[PDB]
Structure 1
């Protein structure tokens, strides 16, 4: 029927998606190692009635043809992969990561996922596992009689015993780097998996080839700026109201045509 109705419907849907993204950002503001995401919009095709640049007359051309819009659509969403704030928990088994990189975990089905939330526990078998049970890929195994666990800046993990003074090396907590961090596919429980967009992961020791270091006892906080989120909420509410008013006006004129 009337094209403006569908155009305004597309606008309403875009505003709804924007509000969904804002609400998702606000919901997990306390999640460790969470990256805020922003949606990007674009317009749909255009119906061209008169072709621009066509011969208006002899030795003259149309300065600009007649093109009518069709609507908008969200094209993609991008995560701001920046450094979050560190908060101290005094726990010896939580490590924050400074710079770039992701810890590698092995999902139970056999695949590999890449995470950034550093807050680990030790299972009954002594292995180092994430909060959720997935074991870290380099397979750190902590012995039973453990007094204190030290994880250095360069990612070498050692544990102290009671008898011998020298701590014993237990493993290397190296981390992976990607060509395009934004292209990683995101799933639940703070996990990312490699896609075609992000290049092949390359493992490296922390502090080399542009990979960040490890701070033991700190957790990285989400990089969410609530002051921006509230203003965006106001903007999306007003835009939704405007589009609803456009729908109402189109309905009114259609009704008036009907009453004819």
Structure 2
């Protein structure tokens, strides 16, 4: 009915998406290996009423044209893939990637999913799996029943010590995958990511060579959410939300006045 009604509708939607993104960041303030997200704002197309640069008389062009905007929207939810802090734990099977890299697991459909969460465990067969849905870790790491301890090297070599045997036996070799643009990964939930077109090809290697990060045993990577920043951004987004409703309130009152008068 009114141009300002639709423009402010896009303003309300944009701030709702921003607040929803911030609210999700606060929810995952204790999720291990979580990467915070920020909303990216941009203005929509501008209606061309008067063309800027139009030849308003010879040797005279419109310095500024009448161009009415169509509002704003959140164009992307950019993942901030910066490193989180390290939590020292006593568990021998929870690991951390110190630097660039992702743990790779086998999804039930057969594809390989990449995760930053290092909270791992074992199943009844001793295969190293995740502590959530129990996805096997690629490549499979089978801990023998004769092991008395587990040590995961910086280079990812998983070794165990057997009673009555020096020179601990190697039972596996971890490989981690890096991405040129980790922010382009598709979050599929359960602290897992899937490669996309904008993510780049998955490049695999030993964890500590070719720029890959190191594997830190008995250590967890905390989420990188800054609660101070999230709460301040929550207040600002609320203010922009309320001032857009004032335009709708003003437009609604104008239409009510016109109907009674005109």
Q: Compute the TM-score of the two structures, normalised by the length of structure 1.
A: 0.98
* CA distance in 1 between partners of 2:129 and 2:115 (Å): 12
Alignment deviations for residues 8-63 of structure 1 (CA, whole Å, 9 cap, x no partner) = 11111111111100110000100000000001011111111111111111221111
Kindly indicate whether residue 46 of structure 2 is the aligned counterpart of residue 46 of structure 1: yes
Question: Which residue in the other structure is 1:178 paired with?
Answer: 179
Question: Which residue in the other structure is 1:134 paired with?
Answer: 135
Where does 1:12-31 land on structure 2 (aligned, <5 Å)?
12-31=12-31
* CA distance in 1 between partners of 2:59 and 2:30 (Å): 67
Deviation at residue 112 of structure 1 after TM alignment: 0.8
Deviation at residue 79 of structure 1 after TM alignment: 0.7
Q: Secondary structure at the match of 2:162?
A: coil
Kindly indicate whether residue 245 of structure 2 is the aligned counterpart of residue 238 of structure 1: no
How many residues are paired up? Answer: 260
Structure 1: runs of 5 or more not aligned: none
Question: Which residue in the other structure is 1:159 paired with?
Answer: 160
Structure 2: runs of 5 or more not aligned: none
* CA distance in 2 between partners of 1:77 and 1:108 (Å): 27
The answer to whether the 8 Å contact 2:100/2:213 transfers is yes
Deviation at residue 237 of structure 1 after TM alignment: 1.4
* CA distance in 2 between partners of 1:188 and 1:55 (Å): 55
Question: Which residue in the other structure is 1:216 paired with?
Answer: 217
* CA distance in 2 between partners of 1:74 and 1:4 (Å): 19
Greater than 4 Å deviation, 4+ residue runs: none
Q: Secondary structure at the match of 1:230?
A: helix
Question: Which residue in the other structure is 2:116 paired with?
Answer: 116
Deviation at residue 178 of structure 1 after TM alignment: 1.2
Deviation at residue 184 of structure 1 after TM alignment: 0.7
